[PDB]
C-alpha cells in the first residue's frame, strides 16, 4: 500500500479552467511521467472533471508529481490514495453520483497504461479491484439507479406516460441543444422512427442525420403530429410552433386513439397554452425534467454510506493482496541475494585443507532465505526495499 | 551518536527557583531513572546552575525524560547533546566562563554513574572525551585564566601590590561574608599567618577556626597592623575601624619598611579617608575587586571561539568512536544470530539421503556475518537495532 501515491485536482476543489490547465495533452503522458520520475508504474485518469495520476514507486517525489498537474493538486498516499480510487470508480466523486461513465473511464485509464507499458503488478491489483468494485457497488446498491440528467429523465417520463417506447415515433421540432440531448436519449433507449423538422430544412437534414432519422417538411407539421407519440420541441425562434388547432386536427386525422407526450424544451415556450387540455395529450417542460433528475439524484445520494461500507471492506482485501505481493517479491530477491553468496562461496571450500554436500548449504541457504525474508517483513516498508537493497548491495560486494 | 539524548534546564534559560524544583534530591536518582525508563545508560549532572540528564537508549522517550526535570526542560539529541556536554565541560556554559569547578563536577557526575552501574560504553566514550577536552581547552587556550571572582581578584591584587604572599600575614577585621571569601582565597593561595579580630571576641574565635588562623583582641589593633601585610576589613557596624592615627602608630612601631595592602570590603567604609595617603600604605575596595573580575571575565569571553573550534574537532573524533563502537556491537550480535542458525542447521544435514566439513559453513557463516553486518551498517540507526532485532527475532524462530 505505502508504495502508492495519488496526485490530482478535481471538480471538488477546482473550477473548469484550473482543470483544463492541468489536463495532459499527450496520449503518451502516462509514459513520459514514468520515465521522468523513474517510477515502477503509473496510470493517468483524466476526464472533464478530474486530472489524477496514480504512481507506483514515486515515493520521495510525490509532491513533485503534484507539480506537473497543478500548484493546488493534492497528494494522497497508501490507503488514502486507493480509497480515493475506489470512491472514483464507485461513482462517489462524481456530480452525477453513481454515473456509469466514470467506471468506463477508469477502465480506459487501466487499458491505456497496459498498452504503453506503465503498469506494474501493484497497480494491476489496485485497478482491477477498483473496477470490480465499481461494478459491484452499482449492482448491490442503488447508487446508479434513476435518471439524473435531462435526457434520461425524458426517457423515464416517456416510459411512464406512454409505456414501451420501442414501437413509438419521435418528432423533433427545432435544433436547440437540450432538444438534441433529449432526442438522442430517446433514440438510445429504443424507438421505431424519428422525424425531424426545422424552419430551415437544412438544419433538419443535419440533425436527422445525427439521430439516424428522417428530415421532414416543417409545413407538414399537422401530419407529423398525427403520426408521432413523443414530440420534442426546442426551436430557437421566439414564436410558439405547436398550436391547439394543429394538435386537434392531427388527432382527428388518426383513426386510432393513443396518448401523445409533448416535451417543451424552449423558452419562450414552443407549445401554445391550452394544448395540455386536449384529450390524449400530455405536455411537460424542461423544468419537469430537471425536477425528475433532482429527485433521483437526491435519492442516489442516500446510497452513499452503503457504497462507502463496500469500499472499506474492499480496502482491507486489496491491502492483504498487496502484502502477499510484497512477500512474494521479497523472497525472490533475498533468494537471489543469498544464492549468489552461496555460489561464490561454493567454489572456495572446493580448494581444501589439503595438503554431493551441495546440499547442506542448499538446506542452510533455504533456511537463511526464510529467516531473512521474514526479518525484512517484520519491520517496514518505508524501508523494506533499501534493507532489501542493503542485503543485496552487501552481497555482491562482500559476498 | 543518534542513540544519545540530553535533557535539562539551566541558568541560561531559568531562574534560581525553577532550577531548585528540577533538582533531584536522591543520590540514587540516576539509577532510578535508568530503571523507570529502561535505559542502556545515564549520567546525571547537577549543580546550582543546571540540572541535566544524559541518557543512552532513551530514545522514543526523550520528551518524557524532559518531564521529570521540568515543563520547560530542553531536549537535545545526538551531536547537539554531545556538543552541549563538551561546551559544559569546557566552561562555556558557565557564568564564570572557563571555571574549573564545572569540569570537576562533570567528572563527579561520571564517577557517580560509574559507581551506581548506570554507565554504558557509549556514555563512557562521550564523558571520557568531554573530560579530556575540558582539560585541553583550559591548557591550550586562555578560557580559564585571570581572576573572575572577588576572592581570586584579591589574590591578583595582593600579588601585584606585595609580591609573593607565602611569607605574608593577613589581618581579617570583622565577619562580613565577602570578607570571609577574600580571606579564604588568600589562605588557599598560601600565606604565613592569619590574625582575626572582631568587636565580639567569640565571632573572631569562630572565623579564625574556619580560616586556620589566630583570634586576636580587637583592642590590640595597632599591634596587629604593625605585623600584617594584607588587611581585609569587613565589619558589620557602621563605624570606621581603621584610622589614620592607628596606621601611623603601627608603621612607626615596626623596624622594617614593607608595603601594607588594606582591602576595605565594608559599606559604609571601614577605612578612614586619608589612610591611603600614608606612606607604604595602599587602600583598595570591594569595588576595585569587582572591576578586576569584570575585566578578566571580558577577556576570557574573547577565547570562546578558539574553544568552540576545539569542540567541533572533538565532536568529529567521538563521532567516529561511537561508530566503531556500533560496528563492534553490530558484528557480535549478527554473529550470535547467524551461528545459532548454523548450529541448529548443523545437526540436521547430519540425518542424510541415506538410505570435518564443519567447515564450509564456518566459512559460509563468516561470509554471511560480514555481508549482513555491513548491510545493517549501510542504512541507519533510527533502525539499525530493530533490523538487528528483526534478524535476531527471525533467527530464533525461523532458524
Ligand atoms: C472532444 N471532447 C473534449 C469531448 N468529446 C466528447 N464528449 C465529451 C468531451 N468532453 C466531455 N465529454 C463528455 O462531456 C461531459 C461533461 O464535461 C463528460 N463527463 C465525464 O467524462 C464524466 N464521466 C466525468 C466524471 C468524473 O467524476 O470525473 C462526458 O460525458
Ligand atoms: C550544601 N550546598 C547546597 C552547597 N555547599 C557547598 N557549596 C555550594 C553549595 N551549593 C553551591 N555551592 C557552590 O556555590 C556556587 C554558587 O551556587 C556553586 N557554583 C557551581 O557549582 C558552579 N561550579 C556551577 C557551574 C555551572 O555552569 O553549572 C558552588 O561553587
Amino acid at each position: 500500500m505505502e508504495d502508492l501515491v495519488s496526485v490530482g485536482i478535481t471538480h471538488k476543489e477546482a473550477e473548469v479552467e484550473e482543470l483544463e490547465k492541468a489536463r495532459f495533452e499527450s496520449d503518451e503522458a502516462v509514459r513520459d511521467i514514468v520515465e521522468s520520475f523513474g517510477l515502477s508504474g503509473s496510470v493517468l485518469l483524466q476526464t472533464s472533471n478530474r486530472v489524477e495520476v496514480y504512481a507506483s514507486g514515486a515515493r520521495d517525489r510525490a509532491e513533485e508529481l503534484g507539480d506537473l498537474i497543478h500548484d493546488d493538486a493534492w497528494v494522497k498516499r497508501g490507503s488514502e490514495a486507493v480509497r480515493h480510487l475506489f470512491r472514483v470508480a464507485s461513482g462517489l466523486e462524481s456530480m452525477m453520483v453513481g454515473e456509469q461513465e466514470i467506471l468506463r473511464q477508469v477502465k480506459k485509464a487501466y487499458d491505456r497504461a497496459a498498452r504503453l507499458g506503465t503498469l506494474d503488478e501493484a497497480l494491476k491489483i489496485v485497478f482491477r479491484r477498483a473496477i470490480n468494485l465499481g461494478k459491484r457497488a452499482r449492482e448491490e446498491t442503488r447508487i446508479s439507479e434513476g435518471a439524473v440528467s435531462i435526457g434520461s429523465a425524458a426517457v423515464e417520463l416517456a416510459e411512464r406516460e406512454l409505456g414501451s417506447l420501442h414501437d413509438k415515433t419521435v418528432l423533433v421540432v427545432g435544433a436547440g441543444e437540450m432538444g438534441k440531448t433529449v432526442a438522442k436519449s430517446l433514440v438510445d433507449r429504443g424507438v421505431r422512427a424519428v422525424l425531424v423538422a426545422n424552419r430551415t430544412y437544412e438544419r433538419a437534414v443535419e440533425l436527422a442525420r445525427d439521430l439516424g432519422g428522417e428530415a421532414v417538411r416543417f409545413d407538414e407539421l399537422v401530419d407529423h403530429l398525427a403520426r408521432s407519440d413523443v414530440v420534442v420541441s426546442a426551436t430557437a425562434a421566439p414564436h410558439p410552433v405547436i398550436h391547439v388547432d394543429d394538435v386537434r386536427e392531427a388527432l382527428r386525422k388518426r383513426d386510432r386513439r393513443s396518448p401523445i407526450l409533448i416535451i417543451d424544451i424552449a423558452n419562450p415556450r414552443d407549445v401554445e397554452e391550452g394544448v395540455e387540455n386536449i384529450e390524449d395529450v400530455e405536455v411537460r417542460t424542461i423544468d419537469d425534467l430537471r425536477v425528475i433528475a433532482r429527485e433521483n439524484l437526491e435519492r442516489r445520494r442516500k446510497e452513499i454510506p452503503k457504497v462507502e461500507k463496500l469500499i472499506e471492506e474492499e480496502l482491507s482485501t486489496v491491502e492483504e493482496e498487496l502484502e502477499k505481493l510484497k512477500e512474494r517479491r521479497l523472497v525472490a530477491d533475498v533468494a537471489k541475494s543469498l544464492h549468489e553468496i552461496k555460489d561464490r562461496e561454493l567454489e572456495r571450500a572446493l580448494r581444501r585443507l589439503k595438503t554431493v554436500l551441495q546440499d547442506f548449504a542448499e538446506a542452510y541457504t533455504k533456511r537463511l532465505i526464510n529467516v531473512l525474508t521474514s526479518a525484512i517483513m517484520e519491520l517496514p516498508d518505508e524501508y523494506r526495499r533499501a534493507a532489501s537493497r542493503a542485503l543485496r548491495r552487501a552481497s555482491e560486494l562482500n559476498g
Side-chain angles (χ1 to χ4, degrees), chain A residues 1-78 80-345 347-399:
Chain A
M1 200 66 88
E2 292 318 323
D3 197 274
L4 303 171
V5 304
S6 193
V7 291
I9 199 83
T10 83
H11 74 98
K12 292 298 199 176
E13 48 277 328
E15 291 292 292
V16 71
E17 41 270 332
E18 293 293 53
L19 295 197
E20 256 156 55
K21 264 184 294 187
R23 188 168 84 207
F24 290 92
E25 193 295 309
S26 174
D27 301 358
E28 290 85 40
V30 66
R31 198 178 55 193
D32 310 328
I33 292 172
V34 162
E35 309 193 46
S36 140
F37 281 82
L39 300 187
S40 174
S42 181
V43 176
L44 174 269
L45 177 60
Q46 132 184 295
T47 71
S48 63
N49 299 142
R50 73 196 54 260
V51 178
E52 298 186 0
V53 171
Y54 293 84
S56 150
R59 139 256 234 145
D60 57 340
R61 304 173 74 194
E63 307 299 310
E64 259 184 277
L65 235 311
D67 287 347
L68 35 129
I69 291 180
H70 190 283
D71 192 89
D72 305 312
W74 38 254
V75 175
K76 294 165 186 289
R77 295 167 200 289
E80 221 353 274
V82 182
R83 174 184 278 108
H84 175 82
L85 180 62
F86 283 6
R87 289 183 66 85
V88 172
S90 297
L92 306 189
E93 295 287 327
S94 299
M95 279 179 301
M96 286 185 286
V97 175
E99 62 149 68
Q100 297 289 163
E101 184 173 83
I102 193 47
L103 181 58
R104 290 191 299 262
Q105 292 163 318
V106 172
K107 169 58 157 152
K108 270 183 163 318
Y110 170 87
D111 290 340
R112 283 161 189 175
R115 172 205 331 146
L116 278 168
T118 59
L119 272 206
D120 63 332
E121 189 155 352
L123 292 166
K124 284 205 204 182
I125 286 174
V126 171
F127 271 84
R128 259 155 128 137
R129 205 154 279 272
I131 288 159
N132 296 154
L133 174 61
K135 174 162 175 261
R136 274 230 298 141
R138 286 184 185 75
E139 269 157 29
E140 295 181 18
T141 85
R142 293 195 294 276
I143 195 74
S144 50
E145 301 290 348
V148 290
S149 61
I150 56 156
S152 64
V155 170
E156 262 177 28
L157 165 73
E159 286 186 349
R160 176 167 55 256
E161 291 294 332
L162 302 174
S164 176
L165 308 182
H166 75 302
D167 64 339
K168 303 310 197 277
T169 295
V170 172
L171 165 58
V172 185
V173 188
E177 287 303 320
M178 287 182 296
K180 292 162 157 195
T181 294
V182 168
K184 281 182 164 170
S185 296
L186 292 161
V187 167
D188 285 335
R189 184 66 198 193
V191 299
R192 179 160 296 189
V194 175
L195 306 177
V196 185
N198 194 290
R199 281 177 198 180
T200 306
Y201 190 60
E202 210 66 22
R203 288 309 72 76
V205 167
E206 289 187 15
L207 182 51
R209 194 196 305 106
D210 288 1
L211 297 172
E214 175 186 13
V216 290
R217 306 289 173 178
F218 181 86
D219 56 81
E220 296 168 45
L221 178 62
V222 168
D223 283 351
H224 306 335
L225 293 167
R227 38 192 294 227
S228 299
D229 316 280
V230 50
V231 181
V232 185
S233 196
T235 72
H239 317 286
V241 310
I242 311 291
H243 292 88
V244 165
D245 297 347
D246 289 348
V247 175
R248 292 196 68 82
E249 194 177 350
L251 299 186
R252 11 200 187 69
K253 196 158 275 221
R254 73 204 200 175
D255 196 9
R256 163 230 77 268
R257 277 192 67 182
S258 65
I260 301 178
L261 163 63
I262 301 179
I263 300 170
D264 195 345
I265 307 259
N267 178 284
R269 313 264 46 141
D270 260 11
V271 187
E272 175 175 21
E273 251 49 82
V275 164
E276 73 277 9
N277 301 321
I278 298 153
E279 56 289 346
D280 294 344
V281 184
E282 295 299 319
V283 182
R284 304 289 188 273
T285 64
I286 176 66
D287 300 317
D288 298 341
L289 307 178
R290 286 175 186 303
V291 166
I292 287 164
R294 182 62 184 190
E295 168 176 355
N296 284 334
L297 174 63
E298 293 167 350
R299 185 161 299 123
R300 286 188 185 207
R301 281 171 170 174
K302 293 168 190 176
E303 295 288 280
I304 286 171
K306 316 178 172 184
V307 174
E308 295 174 326
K309 168 182 199 290
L310 286 192
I311 284 166
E312 295 307 308
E313 302 172 345
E314 205 66 10
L315 275 172
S316 318
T317 302
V318 79
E319 186 184 323
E320 288 337 288
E321 279 169 335
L322 290 165
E323 210 74 57
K324 287 180 279 196
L325 203 201
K326 290 182 156 180
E327 286 175 9
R328 211 256 313 318
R329 285 188 327 195
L330 186 59
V331 65
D333 185 13
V334 172
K336 157 83 150 93
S337 276
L338 274 271
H339 281 117
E340 228 94 276
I341 302 176
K342 190 209 33 196
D343 291 325
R344 285 187 192 194
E345 182 79 0
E347 305 279 302
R348 344 174 145 126
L350 63 53
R351 321 231 231 166
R352 274 213 111 108
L353 206 261
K354 257 298 228 171
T355 305
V356 310
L357 263 47
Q358 274 352 279
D359 194 323
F360 149 81
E362 202 72 23
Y364 182 24
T365 288
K366 285 188 191 151
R367 217 85 217 191
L368 293 156
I369 288 160
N370 189 53
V371 163
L372 290 178
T373 297
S374 302
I376 292 175
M377 264 330 168
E378 257 266 2
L379 205 90
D381 89 275
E382 255 244 3
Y383 298 173
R384 265 166 19 171
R385 189 207 76 284
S388 11
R389 268 164 176 311
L391 163 66
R392 159 73 54 178
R393 171 158 258 160
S395 280
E396 232 105 310
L397 297 172
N398 296 20

